[PDB]
Coordinates of C-alpha atoms and ligand atoms in Angstrom, one line a residue:
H1 CA -0.4 0.1 -0.5
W2 CA 1.1 3.2 -0.6
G3 CA 2.7 5.7 1.9
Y4 CA 6.1 7.5 2.4
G5 CA 9.2 5.3 2.8
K6 CA 11.8 3.8 1.0
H7 CA 9.7 1.1 -0.4
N8 CA 6.2 2.7 -1.1
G9 CA 7.1 6.4 -1.3
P10 CA 6.3 9.3 -3.4
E11 CA 8.5 7.8 -6.6
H12 CA 6.2 4.6 -6.4
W13 CA 2.7 6.3 -6.3
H14 CA 2.4 6.3 -10.2
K15 CA 2.3 2.5 -10.6
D16 CA -1.1 2.0 -9.0
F17 CA -1.9 6.4 -9.6
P18 CA -0.3 7.0 -13.1
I19 CA -2.2 10.8 -12.8
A20 CA 1.3 10.9 -10.4
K21 CA 3.2 12.1 -13.6
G22 CA 0.1 14.2 -15.0
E23 CA 0.1 17.4 -15.5
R24 CA -1.7 19.1 -13.3
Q25 CA 0.0 17.6 -10.0
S26 CA 1.1 19.2 -6.7
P27 CA 2.2 20.4 -4.5
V28 CA 4.8 22.6 -6.5
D29 CA 7.8 25.3 -5.6
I30 CA 6.1 28.6 -5.6
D31 CA 8.7 31.0 -7.2
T32 CA 7.5 34.2 -5.5
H33 CA 9.6 36.5 -8.5
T34 CA 7.8 35.0 -11.2
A35 CA 4.3 34.8 -9.4
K36 CA 2.3 37.2 -11.1
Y37 CA -0.2 39.8 -9.1
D38 CA -4.0 39.4 -10.7
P39 CA -5.5 42.5 -9.9
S40 CA -9.0 40.8 -10.1
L41 CA -8.1 38.6 -7.6
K42 CA -11.0 38.4 -4.7
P43 CA -10.1 38.6 -0.7
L44 CA -10.9 35.0 0.6
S45 CA -14.1 35.2 2.4
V46 CA -13.2 32.6 4.8
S47 CA -17.1 32.0 7.2
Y48 CA -15.8 29.2 9.9
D49 CA -17.9 31.0 13.3
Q50 CA -20.4 28.1 12.3
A51 CA -18.4 25.5 12.1
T52 CA -18.8 21.9 13.6
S53 CA -16.0 19.3 13.7
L54 CA -17.3 15.9 14.8
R55 CA -13.9 13.8 15.4
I56 CA -10.0 13.8 14.9
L57 CA -8.3 10.4 13.3
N58 CA -5.3 9.0 12.4
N59 CA -5.7 7.6 9.3
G60 CA -1.8 5.7 8.7
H61 CA -1.0 9.0 6.6
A62 CA -2.0 12.1 8.8
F63 CA -4.7 12.9 11.2
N64 CA -7.4 14.6 9.8
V65 CA -9.7 16.9 11.8
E66 CA -13.2 16.1 10.6
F67 CA -16.3 18.4 10.3
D68 CA -20.0 18.4 9.6
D69 CA -20.5 19.2 6.0
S70 CA -24.1 18.2 5.7
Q71 CA -25.3 22.4 5.4
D72 CA -22.8 25.8 5.1
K73 CA -21.5 25.9 8.5
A74 CA -18.0 26.1 7.6
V75 CA -17.2 27.2 3.8
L76 CA -14.7 29.3 1.6
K77 CA -15.5 31.6 -1.0
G78 CA -14.0 34.3 -2.5
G79 CA -10.5 34.9 -4.0
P80 CA -10.1 32.6 -7.0
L81 CA -13.2 30.8 -6.3
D82 CA -16.8 30.7 -8.1
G83 CA -20.0 29.5 -5.5
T84 CA -19.0 28.0 -2.2
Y85 CA -16.9 25.2 -0.7
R86 CA -18.1 22.8 2.1
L87 CA -14.6 22.7 5.0
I88 CA -14.7 18.6 5.2
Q89 CA -11.3 18.1 7.1
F90 CA -7.9 19.3 7.7
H91 CA -4.5 18.0 8.0
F92 CA -1.1 18.4 8.5
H93 CA 2.1 17.2 6.7
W94 CA 5.1 17.8 8.6
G95 CA 8.7 16.3 8.8
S96 CA 11.4 14.7 11.2
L97 CA 13.4 17.9 11.3
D98 CA 12.2 21.2 11.6
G99 CA 14.2 22.4 8.3
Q100 CA 11.3 19.9 6.3
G101 CA 7.8 19.4 6.0
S102 CA 6.2 21.6 4.0
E103 CA 4.9 20.2 0.2
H104 CA 4.6 23.6 -1.0
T105 CA 7.9 25.1 -0.8
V106 CA 8.8 29.0 -1.3
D107 CA 11.6 29.7 -4.0
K108 CA 12.6 26.5 -3.0
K109 CA 12.6 26.9 1.3
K110 CA 10.7 24.4 3.0
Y111 CA 8.5 25.1 6.1
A112 CA 8.2 22.7 9.3
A113 CA 4.9 21.9 8.4
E114 CA 1.9 22.7 6.3
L115 CA -1.6 22.8 6.5
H116 CA -4.5 21.8 5.0
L117 CA -8.2 22.9 5.0
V118 CA -10.1 20.9 2.4
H119 CA -12.9 22.0 0.7
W120 CA -16.0 20.5 -1.4
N121 CA -17.5 22.6 -3.9
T122 CA -21.4 22.4 -3.3
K123 CA -22.6 22.4 -6.9
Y124 CA -21.7 18.8 -6.8
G125 CA -23.6 17.7 -3.7
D126 CA -21.0 15.6 -2.0
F127 CA -17.5 15.0 -1.9
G128 CA -17.3 11.7 -4.0
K129 CA -19.1 13.9 -6.9
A130 CA -17.0 16.9 -6.4
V131 CA -13.7 14.8 -6.9
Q132 CA -14.9 13.9 -10.4
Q133 CA -14.6 17.7 -11.4
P134 CA -11.7 19.8 -12.3
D135 CA -13.2 22.4 -9.8
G136 CA -14.5 20.1 -7.1
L137 CA -11.9 20.9 -4.4
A138 CA -10.1 24.2 -2.9
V139 CA -7.7 24.0 -0.2
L140 CA -6.3 26.5 1.8
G141 CA -2.7 26.0 2.7
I142 CA -1.3 27.4 5.7
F143 CA 2.8 27.2 6.2
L144 CA 4.5 26.4 10.2
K145 CA 7.3 27.7 11.1
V146 CA 8.6 26.9 14.5
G147 CA 8.9 29.8 17.0
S148 CA 6.5 30.4 19.6
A149 CA 3.2 28.4 19.9
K150 CA 0.0 28.5 18.2
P151 CA -2.8 29.0 21.2
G152 CA -5.5 27.8 18.8
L153 CA -3.4 24.4 18.2
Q154 CA -2.8 22.6 21.7
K155 CA -6.2 21.0 21.7
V156 CA -5.3 19.4 18.7
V157 CA -1.9 18.9 19.7
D158 CA -3.2 17.2 23.4
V159 CA -5.8 15.1 21.9
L160 CA -3.1 13.5 19.7
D161 CA -1.8 10.8 23.0
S162 CA -5.5 9.3 22.0
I163 CA -4.9 8.3 18.5
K164 CA -1.3 7.0 18.2
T165 CA -1.5 4.7 16.1
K166 CA -3.4 3.7 12.5
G167 CA -7.2 3.8 12.9
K168 CA -7.8 5.2 15.9
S169 CA -9.9 8.4 16.4
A170 CA -11.4 10.3 18.9
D171 CA -14.5 12.4 19.2
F172 CA -13.4 16.4 18.7
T173 CA -16.0 18.7 19.4
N174 CA -16.3 22.1 19.4
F175 CA -12.6 22.4 17.6
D176 CA -12.3 26.2 16.2
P177 CA -10.1 26.1 13.2
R178 CA -10.2 30.2 13.2
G179 CA -7.9 29.7 16.0
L180 CA -5.1 28.1 13.2
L181 CA -5.5 31.0 10.4
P182 CA -2.5 33.6 10.8
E183 CA -3.3 37.5 10.5
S184 CA -3.4 38.1 6.6
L185 CA -5.4 36.0 3.8
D186 CA -2.6 37.3 1.2
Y187 CA -2.2 34.4 -0.5
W188 CA -1.2 32.2 -3.8
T189 CA -3.4 30.1 -6.0
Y190 CA -3.1 28.1 -9.0
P191 CA -4.9 24.6 -9.8
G192 CA -3.9 21.4 -8.7
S193 CA -4.5 18.2 -7.2
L194 CA -4.4 16.1 -4.0
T195 CA -0.9 15.5 -3.1
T196 CA -1.8 11.9 -1.7
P197 CA -3.2 9.2 -3.6
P198 CA -5.2 9.0 -5.4
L199 CA -3.5 12.5 -6.5
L200 CA -6.5 13.5 -8.2
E201 CA -7.2 16.8 -10.6
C202 CA -9.6 18.3 -8.5
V203 CA -7.8 21.2 -6.7
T204 CA -7.9 25.1 -6.5
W205 CA -4.8 25.5 -4.2
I206 CA -4.6 28.9 -2.2
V207 CA -1.4 29.3 -0.6
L208 CA -1.5 31.9 1.8
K209 CA 1.6 33.7 2.1
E210 CA 2.2 34.6 6.1
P211 CA 3.4 31.2 8.3
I212 CA 1.6 30.1 11.4
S213 CA 4.6 29.9 14.6
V214 CA 3.8 26.8 16.3
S215 CA 6.4 25.9 19.4
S216 CA 8.6 23.4 19.3
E217 CA 7.3 21.4 21.5
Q218 CA 3.8 21.1 19.5
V219 CA 5.6 19.7 15.9
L220 CA 7.8 17.2 18.3
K221 CA 4.5 15.7 19.6
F222 CA 3.2 15.7 15.8
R223 CA 6.1 13.2 15.6
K224 CA 5.2 10.8 18.5
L225 CA 2.0 9.7 16.1
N226 CA 2.1 6.5 14.5
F227 CA 1.9 5.3 10.7
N228 CA 1.4 2.0 11.9
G229 CA -1.6 -0.1 13.6
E230 CA -2.0 -0.7 17.5
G231 CA 0.1 -4.0 18.2
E232 CA 2.9 -4.2 15.3
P233 CA 5.9 -2.6 14.8
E234 CA 6.4 0.8 15.4
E235 CA 7.2 3.7 12.6
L236 CA 6.7 7.2 13.8
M237 CA 4.9 9.4 11.9
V238 CA 7.1 12.2 10.4
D239 CA 7.7 12.7 6.8
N240 CA 4.7 13.2 5.2
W241 CA 5.3 15.2 2.6
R242 CA 5.1 14.7 -1.1
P243 CA 8.0 17.0 -2.6
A244 CA 7.6 19.7 -5.2
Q245 CA 6.0 18.0 -8.8
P246 CA 7.0 20.0 -12.4
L247 CA 4.8 23.5 -12.5
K248 CA 4.4 22.4 -16.3
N249 CA 1.8 24.2 -18.4
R250 CA 0.6 26.3 -14.8
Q251 CA 0.8 29.7 -14.0
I252 CA 1.1 31.0 -10.0
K253 CA -0.7 34.0 -9.6
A254 CA -0.8 36.4 -6.4
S255 CA -3.4 38.2 -4.6
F256 CA -1.0 40.5 -3.6
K257 CA 1.5 43.2 -5.1
Ligands
463_301 C1 -14.7 8.8 4.0 C2 -15.4 10.1 4.5 O1 -15.8 10.6 3.6 N1 -14.9 10.7 5.3 C3 -15.5 11.7 5.8 C4 -15.3 12.8 6.1 C5 -15.6 14.0 6.6 C6 -17.4 14.3 6.8 C7 -18.0 13.2 5.9 C8 -19.7 13.3 5.1 N2 -19.3 14.2 3.9 C9 -17.0 12.0 5.7
ZN302 ZN1 -2.3 17.5 2.6

């Protein structure tokens, strides 16, 4: 099964998922000097005040905080998007060391981790139908650097002990994802894909320019999770990131000058 090891990692994924070599794969390096300011891009509209988080799950590849997406409770619109995209889950990618972990890079710089808030386009009715469409998903990507602690992340950190191994979940209600955002909503955007198998080319990426700061202790606790299930040999959940892929025939646009 696919994973992040030498024998099943990103360089192997194309054998079962040929789209891994497709025309709009993610992540990419964001070359800041060649991205283009687009004054027709609108401000991002993040409406999370009514979000209903439900559960946190170790799926063997990351941990997902899942939301009730049966109504327009936590939605992303504006920016490059047409219509309304509902939040379904967020997760992170991170490194074994502070110098790596992000999927997108900025002028080749790697951050310690990257947060993905995954949303689906409500005009397709459900996530499963949305991922059959080229505009089915919108992912808000946020870089993490190590410095001061992020208070709004601590509730996530302190439940991880209860979902150490693949397949474990815990109730995770009343979590406010607004506490994971930076101050500015200035962003880059480009058309891409999910960064995990099945690597579907459905995503409008919206990558925020401003990182959030998290403490060394917070990201250290991410690294105590396990890829394996209970009762199996322990494999620390670290370096669960896909490296940058060829940009090919795509333009990265900036919302700011
Ligand atoms: C596997 C899967 O579909 N999970 C999921 C996560 C969060 C919400 C929902 C309901 N749309 C489903
Ligand atoms: Zn992701």
